[PDB]
Subunit: 260 residues, 3 copies
């Protein structure tokens, strides 16, 4: 029975792990302060909705990363027969424990933050309610089935079946970003900025399922420490710089996005 | 003590249980493909909202049933003194384990899918936001208190108290379906189709608390495998057939439901 | 180790704890009946939306208190080194068990009920969607980070860090309540009733983080039983009397909240 304290201490004493986590807690906090400063001039309710949705991204990130750092949202799971990480062991407390240190808490970071990123993008693109609803519901389904895949230890094949379902949901979100909102942004007069944020988002988001496949959750070419840093690097771009670019535009183009 | 693998293997090797779960994974998948194909011609935003809300039903179902088949959302619980399934055994891994294989994952299938069924129906009936909000919130309360009932092992009476709270929430949903939306559909011009789907929905949904009461969660006249098939059969009609019928109407009457979201 | 039945019995057989839980189950139930009766004459859809949102408060409360009374949402946690409740015992069943009985179920009562309180108040004040969204999202964040604080056992300081994050989110909600909705209510013609409900909400809500700090979750000057009654008393006011007052006004001013 691994304790929360043992996982908290495990993160510590492990350079790659501890740094990938605490650096994001710090960047998330600094991002929030910066973004609040940047948007104090906004008055339009719609511009402010986009701003708050955007600021909620680093808010969810600081809370969720603290969930990981504290050990609260970390568990030790034993992979099923055939899985590349099956047979692995980790030193926890004063004994060797079978399994993999599983940072399932990252899925909470994703399920709560990705909907805010999508809401901000859709509002920016002048999306109607149907498309926002579709993008957000399928995005949440993608995140939850991804968590289910990571939490499945009964069967190797089942883990990848979950992965396939999640990818299917991801395709829906990608279609809306690349095809529908890309067109809607033209009518909203935000075609240029949306194009930039869209490219950034699509490229970075595609990185997550790749890291999943290569990291300990997948074929394990990337160890627990590198897997964590891979995800943390993606978050810095998909969340913090994405948010800065969006807000930097918003604070200089409040008139453009003002509306009902 | 009991592992996910042991539960996964228990489901496999158990013909009734295995089939009740995997057949729905298959039917939900085929439903998604069929529904996406059927609705490819839709252009109106409101019509498309009704379409996506309906399609989300089998999407939630396939994911949720995978949760059950994989063993992820199944647990072994020991019923409280006096419960008709108290003292049951299950044989897992290789030994006899006290308790009942509890497929609590079904409550997730319900909590995430029923709001979508209701959203689709409310929109079809031309419901205002107040009634949709009321129907959906009490519907979620119904499924969550139902899950709590199944997860309660401390007291037999408590299990049924949760069941009673859930039933009361169910009454709110039934009232909205039978009284409010029944009338709203006439103004929306969808009276014939809504009344039909309203009736099909009410009849099938009534089956769930009956199965709960008769199954292993209740008086246990229905063993685990039979309780599972009862729910899976209800799901096939309340979800897949229901959705197929709604989409059939939708794709031939886009203009009728078109308008401001 | 500790079973649900053992926690269920711990609550029973303890006059203080049992009364603090079962009384609210009774009051919540009676409140639902009373409120439904009180609002049976409403016809306006906007007024009805405010009424349902309000009625959901005691609905969530009766379900959540049943979660606690049944033992379903209670756990036994061992506090970290430095915590004032470290090395505590309880006697679960008939044995001496290390740790403190943690009624984390209360956070569920809060995360699901507070958004409904805020939705009702925001609508009464004639708030736009942006402010409602901001108040509700940060309110949920406050509740979830508070839950995380209570569930954290890896570090004593980590618990207070979660507490700090939660307080920051609370300030956002307080700002909207005290500054923004105070103004909106004037234009909506509900300034007088809002002032009353606003005052009651702010004063009562401020009490929760105080009880947290003083109870077993914090410095532990208040035993498990007194911590429970403190929250239960706050709930009676922040929920039931608050709801009654709002509904009493609502039914007497249906036309004003309707708009036209
Ligand atoms: C939490 C619970 C039950 C939930 C709710 C109850 C009781 C009543 C809800 C009534 C409603 C929603 C009326 C809708 C109207 C609007 C209608 C519309 C807009 C749609 O047209 C309006 C104007 C809002 O009123 C369980 C038990 C709660 C309480 C008790 C005492 C249970 C006891 C059980 C046993 C077994 C003894
Ligand atoms: C395993 C779960 C995966 C299910 C994937 C099916 C989702 C179908 C969503 O509908 C489609 O959404 C597009 C973007 O909004 C519309 O352009 C298109 O017309 C509509 O048909
Ligand atoms: C429609 C959803 C698709 C998921 C299909 C999952 C079924 C895979 C079952 O695998 C088998 O399980 C046995 C018992 O655990 C092992 O002994 C055996 O070695 C393994 O190969
Ligand atoms: C609306 C549906 C009706 C549900 C009725 C539920 C009745 C079940 C009561 O349980 C029994 O209560 C006794 C006293 O508390 C216990 O001594 C006994 O062990 C326990 O099994
Ligand atoms: C809608 C379904 C109705 C549910 C009815 C549940 C009744 C359960 C009856 O069980 C019995 O209760 C006795 C106490 O009264 C116990 O002493 C006895 O051991 C127990 O077996
Ligand atoms: C408002 C609804 C609240 C439900 C309250 C349920 C109380 C039922 C208490 O039953 C008793 O519990 C003891 C401890 O487990 C058993 O030893 C005893 O045999 C059993 O009869
Ligand atoms: C630990 C997380 C705490 C971070 C809190 C910062 C969130 C910033 C929310 O934006 C602010 O909301 C106010 C009320 O709506 C507006 O009056 C103000 O103009 C706007 O800038
Ligand atoms: C702040 C975090 C962000 C933007 C996270 C994005 C995550 C994804 C796009 C994840 C996608 C996945 C799949 C498509 C397949 C299964 C595994 C996942 C969950 C990694
Ligand atoms: C796809 C699943 C559907 C349509 C499920 C519907 C479920 C219900 C109507 C459940 C109702 C219940 C009660 C009213 C009492 C307590 C037990 C439940 C949860 C089975
Ligand atoms: C019905 C319940 C109500 C109105 C609950 C309100 C709760 C709060 C305002 C809680 C606030 C907290 C903090 C600000 C800090 C950390 C701990 C909490 C969760 C108790």
């Amino acid at each position: 029975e691994v304790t929360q304290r043992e996982l908290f201490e495990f993160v510590l004493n492990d350079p790659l792990l501890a740094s990938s986590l605490y650096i994001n807690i710090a960047l998330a906090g600094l991002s929030i302060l910066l973004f609040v400063f940047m948007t104090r001039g906004l008055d339009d309710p719609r511009a402010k909705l986009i701003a708050v949705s955007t600021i909620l991204v680093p808010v969810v990130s600081i809370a969720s990363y603290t969930g990981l750092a504290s050990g609260l949202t970390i568990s030790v799971l034993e992979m099923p027969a055939g899985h590349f990480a099956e047979g692995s062991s980790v030193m926890l407390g004063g004994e060797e424990v079978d399994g993999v240190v599983t940072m399932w808490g990252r899925y909470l970071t994703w399920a709560l933050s990705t909907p805010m990123i999508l809401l901000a993008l859709g509002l920016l693109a002048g999306s109607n309610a149907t498309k926002l609803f579709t993008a957000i519901t399928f995005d949440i389904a993608m995140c939850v089935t991804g968590l289910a895949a990571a939490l499945t230890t009964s069967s190797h094949l089942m883990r990848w079946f979950w992965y396939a379902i999640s990818c299917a949901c991801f395709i829906v979100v990608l279609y809306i970003l690349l095809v529908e909102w890309a067109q809607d942004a033209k009518a909203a007069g935000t075609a240029d900025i949306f194009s930039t944020l869209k490219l950034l988002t699509v490229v970075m988001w595609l990185g997550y399922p790749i890291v999943w496949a290569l990291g300990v959750e997948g074929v394990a070419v990337l160890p627990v420490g590198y897997t964590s840093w891979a995800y943390s690097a993606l978050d810095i771009v998909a969340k913090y710089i994405f948010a800065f670019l969006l807000l930097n535009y918003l604070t200089s183009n409040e008139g453009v996005v003002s509306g009902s």
